[PDB]
Design a protein around this nucleic acid. Structure first.
Length: 1017
RNA sequence: GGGUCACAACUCCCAUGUAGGCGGAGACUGCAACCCGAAGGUGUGACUUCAUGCCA
């Protein structure tokens, strides 16, 4: 589908007349392309409240006077009085009576038919939305079901309700058209390739601004500043910033220790100090060597002082964040990339000395960061060296930190499950073929490397999976990037296999790939097909079959298997024989193995834009980095997808550099230095009121115990880094997570399951082995299962689930999951606030352009959104009839003044502080409910944003396998009904009703419910 | 006090109030699928729909 200012092209007349409502007259002006756009743009006329005029849309009032709306309701009531129930009959009767009344009203008034056409279109849209006949979609089904009730039927026919609904619809369409006008002339002064490009650029800028706001909140956390504005140039705040941690009459050693300890969670300060100390020591022993340590020697006096280093690092950070906040939303630079280039041109890297030293120290640490990751996952305690050396050799390897992945590249997990299932199916069919024919076929190894072992524990398969994941991520994908023919070297074969089961589902996929086509185009069409399939499944409320995703998984699994055969064939037997040994685990880390990851980032001189953007990436935890990386991947694919006359090569290269830098920051962990044995002098306090008794009573684990990875430690470090512990100790105080029932259940070693096969289960490993054995026996024989084993399965399942929930509550995994969910609820509202800010900027620009505001210039508009508060600038700038004109676009008459303050509450991230979790006198609701309702009030200029508030909250909750229900109470307020947890359905078709297990425990659900309604609600 | 009734989106367009099409299109406007991915448990292979059978 392609449309332009002329027509539209690939019912038929709807395709042809689908063109843009706006056009450029080649002189900088935008003019309407039809009558409806001109009518929508001229509806808003500002009104003087002192003179007596109240509304800003007089034509809508006159049209609501002409359209009676009172005899229509009586006519419809009289018409449907002879229908009883049967909501479809009511729908046809209402539709017929409505079209009769509309044609009579059109015949009655011939003078004002022109605007009557658009009024009739709005009325017909209302009646089609609320009285549906067809029920193919789900929403139409529930509207028809709601048509059964007589009370809702009476409510839907009120004259005031219908008039207000038509007015709201028309005002919403007018506002959207003004915003579309204002989007142009801010980027332009062909539709398909330009509007999508503007959408992509705005998405990238908004994601960057969310990252900037997160780093601003982190900087305010560092400086311990109460309200105000840290990124300021006026005298008192600047003098406070320049004097921070100076002297001793104002600040104490505890202050500098707390500041440097907060800074250590994001920055490698201790390693930098040790590096400078060893660099100073080495200069006194060599008298003739041209080493690259001149830059490090200049800043030796700063980094040797804690106060000076902290103050200087905070100063350079504040300079970078302030320059980023000044730009990006500037009117000059179209792209964030050229904004970074202009910042790097303005501010030289000679000023940023501590920042560039931190960048260099982090760049020259990948060599041991990769070794730390390899040791951390599973690898050394299941392989007896001299094979990891054959894979991760210390000489130059084909391993890289980050590959510029192509769109819709599958993850390792889906590929692994698909290949493992295909291998199991092949094994079963070969065994069944050996039963029918007693001849041993010499073939049978065509899909190995996905074998499920037969040491055969669950940890051994974990280690094998992790090794294959490392090879897939750092070796196979750069090889595919350099030479894609590997994947193509399999594609035809997979299609043939599908045909071998026809005597199909890949018929749609058989037509796209002819002979030789760039896989990039293939994944773009498969992305389109997957998108339509998912959207249709979501719309029609049915679960369908995804053939394109399965095809992608199949071809990538075949390519991975053949690649592993080509390079690691001599070590297949040694890879498939893991063996647990703690001696190699205690070794391999005292040797400082320092493996040989490679990257394209320079080792002696950082680039200017990368150095400017480095603290922003350094101040994001784990998920905002992923969102920024996905936005950069989408931007790169979008730039590559456009045709000629583009000139976007340098932007593509810089975007790839940003992706690689983000991957480097993600890989190079900040070295949490927990040390000690259990506690230190930070988390201990931040974690007293979550342990039911004392931590010494839980000494069996939390220290030594299994002598393995201590997740509890990574969980507590990542929990304490996020800075939400003060909020959680104010809100979730009486919701202790360690408990004593869970520790008693974990210390239980005398399970009462009474296993049938001449033994008794005493450990969770034996229970997991019984689950695996019983599930394999069920998998081979689904239709024939003994009644004893079917209840034995549930008997071990419930005990294992109780044990796992006790472990998850004890290991602080539930609290960390709640923190991840809470930080996901935030930064969605920040995205909503960014959307509102951009929309209001473009709306005000469009209003000023078409002479709507009298004594207001474009300079004032840009100065509203340049510096200072946006809200205060709007209040001090627009007044009289202009403020009434601005307020005319928010329909919900229940609100009054003091609104738009939720923008300042969200953008400053007040919910990340203890003082923000307080409510006004009254309001009878919870903090989250209050924020939801104020967000609906703020976003009421756009209907889709107002519905997307609750929609996105429900989707975020459902991503964690948790439900949440809302009910609308009196006055239109939303309130939380319940939360609960969904259930995973175990063995199906087992001559039994099916075992049902909740996906989350009661402690997790109760804590999430306590967070959602803090005061009441 | 339907006055913010979301979940069950929103926008645009199909010739003469006629005429439909209660029909189409939309990374063009937002949620999604895909990835982040740790977290993780729900047997598989193969095809139709307003979620249940159909064959080894």
């Amino acid at each position: 589908f392609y449309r332009d200012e002329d027509s539209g092209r690939l019912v038929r007349y709807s395709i042809k007349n689908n063109k843009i409502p706006l056009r450029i007259q080649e002189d900088g002006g935008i003019t309407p392309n039809n009558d409806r756009a001109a009518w929508l743009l001229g509806l808003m006329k500002p009104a003087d409240p002192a003179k007596g005029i109240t509304d800003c849309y007089p034509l809508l009032g006159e049209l609501e006077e002409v359209f009676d709306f009172d005899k229509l309701s009586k006519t419809l009531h009289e018409k449907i009085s002879r229908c009883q129930g049967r909501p479809r009959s009511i729908a046809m009767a209402v539709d017929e009576a409505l079209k009769q009344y509309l044609r009579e009203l059109w015949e009655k008034s011939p003078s004002r038919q022109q605007d009557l056409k658009y009024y009739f279109q709005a009325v017909q849209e209302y009646f089609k939305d609320n009285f549906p006949i067809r029920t193919k979609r789900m929403g139409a089904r529930l509207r028809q079901e709601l048509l059964k009730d007589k009370t809702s039927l009476s409510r839907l026919l009120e004259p005031k309700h219908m008039a207000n609904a038509v007015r709201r619809r028309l005002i919403n369409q007018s506002t959207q058209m003004h915003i579309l006008y204002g989007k142009l002339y801010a980027y332009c002064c062909v539709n398909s390739e330009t509007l999508q490009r503007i959408q992509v650029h705005e998405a990238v800028k908004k994601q960057a601004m969310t990252a900037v706001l997160w780093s601003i909140s982190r900087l305010r956390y560092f400086y311990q500043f109460e309200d105000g504005d840290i990124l300021s140039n006026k005298n008192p705040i600047k003098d406070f910033r320049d004097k921070f941690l100076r002297d001793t009459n104002k600040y104490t050693h505890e202050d500098v220790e707390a500041c440097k300890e907060k800074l250590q969670d994001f920055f490698p300060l201790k390693e930098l100090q040790e590096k400078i100390k060893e660099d100073a020591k080495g200069l006194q022993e060599t008298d003739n060597k041209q080493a690259d340590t001149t830059d490090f020697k200049a800043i030796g006096h700063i980094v040797r002082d804690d106060r000076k280093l902290c103050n200087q690092l905070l100063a350079e950070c504040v300079s970078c964040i302030g320059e980023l906040r000044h730009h990006i939303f500037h009117y000059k630079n179209v792209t964030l990339i050229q904004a970074l280039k202009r910042i790097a041109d303005k501010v030289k890297p000679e000023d940023l000395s501590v920042l560039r030293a931190i960048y260099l120290l982090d760049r020259r640490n990948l060599k041991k960061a990769f070794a730390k990751r390899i040791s951390s996952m599973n690898l050394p305690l299941y392989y007896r060296e001299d094979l990891l050396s054959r894979i991760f050799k210390k000489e130059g390897t084909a391993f890289f930190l980050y590959s510029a992945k192509i769109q819709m590249t599958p993850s390792f997990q889906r590929v692994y499950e698909r290949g493992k299932n295909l291998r199991r199916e092949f094994e079963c069919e070969r065994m069944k073929a050996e039963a029918s024919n007693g001849q041993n076929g010499q073939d049978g190894d065509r899909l190995k490397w996905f074998r499920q072992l037969a040491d055969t524990d669950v940890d051994a398969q974990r280690a094998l999976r992790n090794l294959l994941l490392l090879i897939y991520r750092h070796h196979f994908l750069p090889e595919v990037q350099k030479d894609e023919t590997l994947v193509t070297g399999k594609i035809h074969k997979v299609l043939e296999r599908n045909r071998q089961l026809s005597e199909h589902g890949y018929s749609v996929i058989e037509e796209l790939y002819h002979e030789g086509m760039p896989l990039s185009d293939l994944m773009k069409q498969l992305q389109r097909r997957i998108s339509e399939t998912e959207r249709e499944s979501r719309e029609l409320a049915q679960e369908k079959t995804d053939y394109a995703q399965r095809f992608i998984l199949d071809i990538f699994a075949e390519a991975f298997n053949d690649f592993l055969e080509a390079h690691y064939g001599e070590e297949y037997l040694e890879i498939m024989s893991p063996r647990k040994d703690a001696e190699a685990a205690k070794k391999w880390v005292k040797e400082s193995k320092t493996v040989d990851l490679k990257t394209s980032i320079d080792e002696k001189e950082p680039e200017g834009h990368l150095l400017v953007l480095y603290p922003v990436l350094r101040l994001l935890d784990e998920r905002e980095l992923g969102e920024l990386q996905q936005q950069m991947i989408r931007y790169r694919t979008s730039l590559a997808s456009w045709q000629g006359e583009s000139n976007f090569s340098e932007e593509i290269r810089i975007a790839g550099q940003i992706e690689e830098l983000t991957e480097l920051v993600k890989l190079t962990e900040p070295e949490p230095q927990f040390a000690e044995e259990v506690w230190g002098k930070r988390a201990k306090e931040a974690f007293e009121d979550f342990i039911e008794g004392n931590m010494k009573n839980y000494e069996a684990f939390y220290l030594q115990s299994d002598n393995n990875t201590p997740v509890y430690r990574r969980n507590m470090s990542r929990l304490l880094r996020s800075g939400l512990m003060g909020v959680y100790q104010k809100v979730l105080a009486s919701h202790k997570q360690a408990l004593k029932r869970d520790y008693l259940l974990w210390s239980e070693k005398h399970w009462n399951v009474k296993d049938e096969n001449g033994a008794d289960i005493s450990s969770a490993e034996q229970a997991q082995c019984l689950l695996q054995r019983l599930h394999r026996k069920y998998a081979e024989s689904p239709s024939r299962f003994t009644e004893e084993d079917c209840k034995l399965y549930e008997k071990v399942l419930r005990r294992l689930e109780d044990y796992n929930q006790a472990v998850k509550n004890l290991s602080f995994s539930s609290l960390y999951e709640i923190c991840v969910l809470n930080l996901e609820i935030l930064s969605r509202w920040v995205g909503f606030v960014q959307d509102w800010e951009r929309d209001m900027y473009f709306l005000l620009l469009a209003w000023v352009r078409q002479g709507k505001l009298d004594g207001i210039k474009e300079e004032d508009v840009r100065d509203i959104f340049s510096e200072g508060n946006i809200i205060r600038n709007l209040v001090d700038t627009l007044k009289g009839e202009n403020m009434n004109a601005f307020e005319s676009v928010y329909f919900p008459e229940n609100k009054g003044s003091k609104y738009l303050g939720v923008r300042n509450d969200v953008a400053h991230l007040d919910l990340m502080r203890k003082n923000g979790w307080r409510l006004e006198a009254g309001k009878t609701c919870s903090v989250m409910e209050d924020y939801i309702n104020r967000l609906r009030f703020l976003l009421s200029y756009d209907q889709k944003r107002m519905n997307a508030v609750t929609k996105t909250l429900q989707q975020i909750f459902d991503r964690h396998k948790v439900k949440i229900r809302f009910t609308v109470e009196k006055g239109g307020m939303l309130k939380i009904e319940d939360v609960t947890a969904d259930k995973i359905v175990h063995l199906k078709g087992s001559r039994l009703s099916g075992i049902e297990i909740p996906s989350h425990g009661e402690r997790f659900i109760d804590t999430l419910k306590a967070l959602m309604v803090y005061p009441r609600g």
